[PDB]
């Protein structure tokens, strides 16, 4: 409740974004999910087909909210977030397997199915969608048989499935596996998120093909090769971006930030304070601009005094005359030219005996910490 | 015939722009000064294994070499990538062509797309079923071997054929010496200039001096 | 090889005494301060992410204590600079007439022609020494102009007043007489200075010119400071690179994790990232604290050297360069100080026959100051560090006892 | 505010201890920061996970505290070595080192004990009232050059004396205050005066 | 016991190395402290978790060892600076310091 005289680092200044920018390719094509999930015939597990999905807008909301799917498991991504983020391409693997083996089609699984005819990688990013097909597939039907992740293996190791409607566990299931990739590359499949007009030279919340971030977008002179979509810095963050709609490159500079230091004398003297915004210009915030930042609440004074509260770059602050906080360039000492010449000497005619005090720490409190009792006391 | 690869076979590992930095990338490059097989097209398209990655360098004066084939048996018993570049059209097919005993060009299909003095360097590799191509063109004045210098290669197409490719072949237009390198997973110290152009590189596994340069990132 | 072999021509009655000398100016370079870097908890670990900040709140006061440690280091840097340089109460300036008895000092005095009043050697030194993730660099309290003003004041006070300005008020004295004081302080009579003044001024000026040439040619002289700068910059670079590591998470991008997964799993990924980045911050802060302790030790040494070597004449051996210390001059350097130590080095020694004492009338005579030497035929008494033979008189020696005690006593006449 | 050096050490130690104590109230991701609450609530299989989170957090807190303590102890040991050196060289003797024992010419020092420290009362000699004088490196008497044995030659305007360095005690320039070396043609700035 | 100052340094370094070696026998919460035993036991999905626990423990051990070594090196460097000063001022000359 009482603060001593000095300068204290308290908070952090950060320019907040004014508006959010969403930019996606303006393709009106719809991804052909109907011909995948509602296909008349599905391939077998040994020869599961790999449908190629690209250059279209994929609406996963209908897929997620459709009640016809027995299970809807997404492993690398959230099913709700599918519409917002987007991918370079999507791969749908369609096949029919034994009902109890729906567990086996998951990352990090082993079994007769997970090892022989269909294996998912441990770094799988995508969604698996399965539903029973008793009223389409069951007859009996003997067209289904079985025999490195994503392999197609086209006394024999091949034994067929006999599916009949009078069979829950043994009942057939139709499953579609959606595979996603997240390499930084020109995206072609993006969800139904409407793009917006872009604004420059303003702290905004941009979103380029699912690449979220906050910063100031300005015109850039950096040449981006035609295959280059993003530019990244040393810290893996995106430095420059190429607009998906118009082929232009925009610099990404983070919004202005800096520490906030409050300059005060003691509350026992006064309650006035001065605020220093470290390393910012006096535009993003009785305003004094220093090399240490922007100083607010302190009056600039031409006179130079001994430093009282250090601010930086030769600037100090003090509470002086009515009284107020003043900012000044600190004085190094009184000027004194020695009366030097080649035949003059100054010799003291007197002296004084001075006793000065020097104070030195010698020891510190001998604290011993019971390690076990501190971490796991009486447990 | 064999010869040294000098400092060729360098391409941009990814589509990310980098400027005035030295980036280290663990990617399939060809080793510097490596032994690259030499083939003669005067007065040869044998069986060439693909291994884990394949480079290509073609020194051209009359565009004799135009296409490439990819597969395991190449007798229409399995899917085979086929790339042909005739006139001003680039044609790519993937299906089970019944190739001849000695395939050449005179002077169940799942995918299809239709679009010395010259060096057309190439890169071919399959990653989880994704076929990637890197290419670049540069003019020289030399016929004996690879000129000594540096030049980067940029990607063109990703073809997700997902086809087992343990072998490949070239297409010769018979009325052109071509080189077959090989790419190994070697770390390279890539030097990007202010324009994002790779002006120099260091093969971290070439010699102890290169190891020092890579460890010091300089 | 450990050095050239040198067997000393030692014998029980032989002494070597220098007949000449050389004035050598050597350079000692000491780090004083380092860069004042500040790091932000939330912007480094959980930059503009409310979920990540809320998850980081479960760790307590770790990174606020880290911020406290970094602030302590930053204040310590300014304290080090103040202790080293602000050793003078007043800003002394030299007279417009540089009548220093042949000594030049032009290359170490401030140059008014420059926007920053730095000397030629200070300019040479400053020309020899060469982000957006919550990392800020705080400017030092004392600007380079103010450091140059301190060095100028110290050097002007030294030149114009000897050690009197360091002791109390500045008492002017001609520089030749000050150098005579210094010669007396190393055991050489001041008449040696007053008789070799031109030679000594020429030697000092030549040594200063050699310092200039060395600083202009060799760039590895400032290695002590460049090492500190490189260490700080490279620690910062490592801290920045640590933000690109997954630490077991699906991705190293917090925004990518947030936009992808539901909060229950984003919590796991963000917690892995938080643990990794917190460990990186703690490692960086510990290294910074140890390096700051080293820099504080160096700055304490530099302040002690300034006080005992620039503000006075030091009798400690090798504390102020090799040889008998005469005087030192400070020069400001980027995050450091450079001392120009002026020392006296004996040059041309000669072999003499020596005796502990001399018999005159059954009495033993010992030199008041100096030693007894013989040029083969005649015995003289000369000061230790300069061959200035003199007739052995009763004013040169004192009597103690008789001839039957001293081992090695010789027979001669005491005038 | 004179005892700030000691008060800072005391405050730093107490504040480090306070931070170490406050670190015991953090969840570190567990359901609760109370070990007894965790144990009385969950079966051993899940109590193991919660307790492991707490253990990692508290062990990290202890390691941070101990590292800071070691660094601060090294600093305190450096200060104590300086204090011991000052005692030995400044109380047990007279120090010629400049500013090692206060400002001025050191005479003697007195030790005083302070809580976790030591206080030195440095007695020094400080020249007070200087006067301008005309001076000369040497003096010509009979074609000889006379240099002061100890002190300097000064002139009060008309007469030349010899006085010690740090106190104005003018004395008649005699052959016992000076020594002879060479002649008058070498010294720069020699002056003419009689040597008694 | 005259050379206790040096024997302490030797013993401290040996004890630090011994502690670093012993830290390899700790489970750190994993089912085993033997990396080969863990690998030969479980599938990669769970071996990854066990190996990650071991990695965290051993990395913490290494960081602790390096921090202690840095602090001890600073102390030894202070002692060596004192020794060099003593040599220069006390063997190469005569010292008036009490
Ligand atoms: C050298 O400096 C000392 C002081 O450091 C001088 O001693 C001071 O001399 C003055 C003048 O005689 C004293 O002032 C007198 O004080 C008495 C106190 O009873 C007062 O009654 C008089 O009216 C007058 O104000 C002063 O006290 C004295 N200081 C001390 C500590 O004794 C000394 O005179 C100086 N010597 C020379 C040669 O300049
Ligand atoms: C002090 O030294 C400087 C440089 O060493 C002298 O200045 C030089 O003077 C000569 C002759 O006048 C010129 O040819 C040079 O160009 C000067 N150099 C510089 C850097 O100024 C200076 O004269 C010396 N001081 C005295 C009193 O002679
Ligand atoms: C002492 O050494 C100095 C050199 O440091 C000698 O001075 C040199 O003398 C030679 C010959 O007279 C000259 O050519 C040089 O130019 C002089 N150098 C300087 C810097 O003045 C000096 O002669 C020596 N004294 C004795 C007595 O031998
Ligand atoms: C040793 O020094 C003495 C004194 O300088 C030398 O004696 C003088 O020698 C010169 C000529 O060499 C004569 O003019 C003087 O008259 C001599 N002085 C006396 C008092 O006799 C002596 O020659 C020197 N000896 C050697 C071996 O150098
Ligand atoms: C120094 O001189 C004294 C006398 O001037 C020498 O003393 C003589 O020593 C011899 C022995 O060799 C005696 O026979 C004499 O009687 C002594 N004389 C006197 C007056 O006592 C002394 O030996 C000389 N020293 C040297 C080293 O020759
Ligand atoms: C400089 O000092 C000398 C010596 O103290 C002064 O000369 C004396 O002055 C007094 C008073 O005028 C006379 O009684 C003495 O007889 C003088 N002594 C001699 C040897 O002449 C001289 O007056 C002083 N000058 C100044 C300007 O202070
Ligand atoms: C101190 O400096 C002055 C000049 O400031 C010197 O005075 C000169 O002396 C020379 C003879 O040595 C004369 O030729 C000049 O005319 C004098 N100039 C002036 C302006 O008076 C004085 O000699 C110097 N003294 C010493 C001891 O160095
Ligand atoms: C000190 O006295 C000597 C003589 O004892 C002075 O030297 C004379 O100076 C005058 C004027 O320049 C000349 O005319 C004489 O020829 C010189 N004589 C000798 C023997 O050198 C000397 O000038 C005096 N010093 C001062 C500073 O006045
Ligand atoms: C986006 O729209 C612009 C015109 O507004 C057009 O030039 C561009 O080709 C479009 N991009 C896509 C991917 O449709
Ligand atoms: C398949 O058809 C059903 C209705 O028969 C519909 O509800 C579902 O959305 C369709 N799925 C796709 C992927 O078109
Ligand atoms: C500080 O505050 C106290 C009251 O808490 C008051 O008695 C004292 O005078 C104050 N000191 C100053 C210097 O104002
Ligand atoms: C602040 O911005 C102005 C222009 O708007 C510029 O002239 C000035 O130099 C800037 N100052 C700082 C400290 O950035
Ligand atoms: C300082 O004085 C100058 C004129 O001497 C004036 O222009 C300037 O505004 C003054 N600055 C302040 C902060 O008062
Ligand atoms: C390359 O081939 C030459 C002969 O043509 C052979 O001597 C050399 O060992 C080979 N080097 C490698 C790396 O294959
Ligand atoms: C090139 O080859 C293709 C074979 O795929 C053929 O159809 C075409 O006519 C040829 N010529 C051109 C100009 O494309
Ligand atoms: C095409 O593939 C089917 C797969 O069962 C196979 O039966 C058929 O023979 C193939 N046809 C050709 C021409 O390869
Ligand atoms: C690809 O074909 C080769 C040649 O028959 C075969 O050995 C290999 O097992 C096949 N599959 C691969 C390389 O994954
Ligand atoms: C970058 O490009 C500009 C013009 O496009 C050219 O002038 C400059 O030389 C280039 N620099 C490099 C390093 O390629
Ligand atoms: C003194 O004499 C010895 C005899 O060996 C010789 O080595 C040495 O150089 C001589 N010293 C001088 C200064 O001449
Ligand atoms: C010095 O040594 C010599 C032999 O080298 C010997 O004759 C002489 O007596 C010795 N003198 C003294 C004083 O030791
Ligand atoms: C000596 O004379 C100079 C002449 O400028 C003057 O400034 C100085 O104060 C004088 N010193 C004393 C002690 O009177």
UniProtKB/Swiss-Prot annotation, chain B:
Domain BetaCoV S1-NTD: 1-216
Disulphides: 95-109, 204-214
Effect of residue 145 to G: In strain: Beta/B.1.351
Positions of the UniProt region annotated as Putative superantigen: 193-214
Annotated phenotype, changing residue 44 to A: In strain: Beta/B.1.351
Annotated phenotype, changing residue 164 to Q: Increased resistance to neutralizing antibodies
Residues with attached carbohydrate: 35, 86, 108, 164, 195
Effect of residue 26 to H: In strain: Omicron/EG.5.1
Superkingdom assignment: Viruses
Function: Attaches the virion to the cell membrane by interacting with host receptor, initiating the infection. The major receptor is host ACE2. When S2/S2' has been cleaved, binding to the receptor triggers direct fusion at the cell membrane. When S2/S2' has not been cleaved, binding to the receptor results in internalization of the virus by endocytosis using host TFRC and GRM2 and leading to fusion of the virion membrane with the host endosomal membrane. Alternatively, may use NRP1/NRP2 and integrin as entry receptors.
Quaternary context: Binds to host ACE2. RBD also interacts with the N-linked glycan on 'Asn-90' of ACE2. Cleavage of S generates a polybasic C-terminal sequence on S1 that binds to host Neuropilin-1 (NRP1) and Neuropilin-2 (NRP2) receptors. Interacts with host integrin alpha-5/beta-1 (ITGA5:ITGB1) and with ACE2 in complex with integrin alpha-5/beta-1 (ITGA5:ITGB1). May interact via cytoplasmic c-terminus with M protein. May interact (via N-terminus) with host bilirubin and biliverdin, thereby preventing antibody binding to the SARS-CoV-2 spike NTD via an allosteric mechanism.
Name of the protein this chain belongs to: Spike protein S1
Taxonomic placement: Viruses, Riboviria, Orthornavirae, Pisuviricota, Pisoniviricetes
């Amino acid at each position: 409740f009482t603060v001593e005289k000095g300068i204290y680092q308290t908070s952090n200044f950060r320019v907040q974004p004014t508006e959010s920018i969403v930019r996606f390719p303006n393709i009106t094509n719809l991804c052909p999910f109907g011909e995948v999930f509602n296909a008349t015939r599905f391939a077998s597990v040994y020869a599961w087909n790999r449908k190629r999905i690209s250059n279209c807008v994929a609406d996963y909301s209908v897929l997620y909210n459709s009640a016809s799917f027995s299970t809807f498991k997404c492993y690398g991504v959230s099913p709700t977030k599918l519409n917002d983020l987007c991918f370079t391409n999507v791969y749908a693997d369609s096949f029919v397997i034994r009902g109890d083996e729906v567990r086996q089609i998951a990352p990090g699984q082993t079994g007769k199915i997970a090892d022989y005819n269909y294996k998912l990688p441990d770094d799988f990013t995508g969604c698996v969608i399965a539903w029973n097909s008793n009223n389409l597939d069951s007859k009996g039907n003997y067209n289904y048989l079985y025999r490195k992740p994503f392999e197609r293996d086209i006394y024999f190791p091949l034994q067929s499935y006999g599916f009949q409607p009078t069979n829950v566990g043994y009942q057939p299931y139709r499953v579609v596996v959606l595979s996603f990739e997240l390499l930084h590359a020109p995206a072609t499949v993006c969800g139904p998120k409407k793009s917006t007009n872009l604004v420059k030279n303003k702290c905004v919340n941009f979103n380029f093909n699912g690449l979220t971030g906050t910063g100031v977008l300005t015109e850039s002179n950096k040449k981006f090769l035609p295959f280059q979509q993003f530019g990244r810095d040393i810290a893996d963050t995106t430095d420059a971006v190429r607009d998906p709609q118009t082929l232009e490159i925009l610099d990404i500079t983070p919004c202005s930030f800096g520490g906030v230091s409050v300059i005060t004398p003691g509350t026992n003297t006064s309650n006035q304070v001065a605020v220093l915004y470290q390393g910012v210009n006096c535009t993003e915030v009785n305003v004094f601009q220093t090399r240490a930042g922007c100083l607010i609440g302190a009056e600039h004074v031409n006179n130079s005094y001994e430093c009282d509260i250090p601010i930086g770059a030769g600037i100090c602050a003090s509470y002086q005359t009515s009284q107020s906080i003043i900012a000044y360039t600190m004085s190094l000492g009184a000027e004194n030219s020695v009366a030097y010449s080649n035949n003059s000497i100054a010799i003291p005619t007197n002296f004084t005996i001075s006793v000065t005090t020097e104070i030195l720490p010698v020891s510190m409190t001998k604290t011993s910490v019971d390690c076990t009792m501190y971490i796991c006391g009486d447990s | 015939a064999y010869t040294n690869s000098f400092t060729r076979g360098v391409y941009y590992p990814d589509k990310v722009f980098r400027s005035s930095v030295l980036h280290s990338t663990q990617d399939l490059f060809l080793p510097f000064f490596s032994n690259v097989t030499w083939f003669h097209a005067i007065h040869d398209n044998p069986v060439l294994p693909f291994n884990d990655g394949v480079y290509f360098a073609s020194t051209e004066k009359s565009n004799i070499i135009r296409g490439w084939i990819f597969g395991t048996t190449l007798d229409s018993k399995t899917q085979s990538l086929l790339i042909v570049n005739n006139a001003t059209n680039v044609v790519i097919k993937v299906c089970e062509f019944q190739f001849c005993n000695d395939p050449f060009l005179g002077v169940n299909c799942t995918f299809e797309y239709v679009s010395f003095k010259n060096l057309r360097e190439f890169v071919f590799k399959n990653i989880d079923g994704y076929f990637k191509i890197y290419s670049k063109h540069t003019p020289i004045n030399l016929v004996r071997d690879l000129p000594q210098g540096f030049s980067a290669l940029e990607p063109l197409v990703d073809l997700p054929i997902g086809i087992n490719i343990t072998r490949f072949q070239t297409l010769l237009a018979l009325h052109a010496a071509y080189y077959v390198g090989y790419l190994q997973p070697r770390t390279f110290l890539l030097k990007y200039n202010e324009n994002g152009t790779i002006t120099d590189a260091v093969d971290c596994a070439l010699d102890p001096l290169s190891e020092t340069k890579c460890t010091l990132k300089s | 090889s450990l050095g050239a072999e040198n067997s000393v021509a030692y014998s029980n009655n032989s002494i070597a005494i220098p007949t000449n000398f050389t004035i050598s100016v050597t350079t000692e370079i000491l780090p004083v301060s380092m860069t004042k870097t500040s790091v932000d908890c939330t912007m480094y670990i959980c930059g503009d992410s409310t979920e990540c900040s809320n998850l980081l709140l479960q760790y307590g006061s770790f990174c606020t204590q880290l911020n406290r440690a970094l602030t302590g280091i930053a204040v310590e840097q300014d304290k080090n600079t103040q202790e080293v340089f602000a050793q003078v109460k007043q800003i002394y300036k030299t007279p417009p007439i540089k009548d220093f008895g042949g000594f030049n000092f032009s290359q170490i005095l401030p140059d008014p022609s420059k926007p920053s009043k730095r000397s030629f050697i200070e300019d040479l030194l400053f020309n020899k020494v060469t982000k957006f993730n919550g990392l800020t660099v705080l400017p030092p309290l004392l600007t380079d102009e103010m450091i140059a003003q301190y060095t100028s004041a110290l050097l002007a006070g030294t030149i114009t007043s000897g050690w009197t300005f360091g002791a109390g008020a500045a008492l002017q004295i001609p520089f030749a007489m000050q150098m005579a004081y210094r010669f007396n302080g190393i055991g050489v009579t001041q008449n040696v200075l007053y008789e070799n003044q031109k030679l000594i001024a020429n030697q000092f000026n030549s040594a200063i010119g050699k310092i200039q040439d060395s600083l202009s040619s060799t760039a590895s002289a400032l290695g002590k400071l460049q090492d500190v700068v490189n260490q700080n910059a490279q620690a910062l670079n490592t801290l920045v690179k640590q933000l690109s590591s997954n630490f077991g998470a699906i991705s190293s991008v917090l925004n990518d994790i947030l936009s992808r997964l539901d909060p229950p799993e984003a919590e796991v990924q963000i917690d892995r990232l938080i643990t990794g980045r917190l460990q990186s911050l703690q490692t960086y802060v510990t290294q910074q604290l140890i390096r700051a302790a080293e820099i504080r030790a160096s700055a304490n040494l530099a302040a002690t050297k300034m006080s005992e070597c620039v503000l006075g004449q030091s009798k400690r051996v090798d504390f102020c360069g090799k040889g008998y210390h005469l005087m030192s001059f400070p020069q400001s350097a980027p995050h450091g100080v450079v001392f120009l130590h002026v020392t006296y080095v004996p040059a041309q020694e000669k072999n003499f026959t020596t005796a502990p004492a001399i018999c005159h009338d059954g009495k033993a005579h010992f030199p008041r100051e100096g030693v007894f030497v013989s040029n083969g035929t005649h015995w003289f008494v000369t000061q230790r560090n300069f061959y200035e033979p003199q007739i052995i008189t009763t004013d040169n020696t004192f009597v103690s006892g008789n001839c039957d005690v001293v081992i090695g006593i010789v027979n001669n006449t005491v005038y």
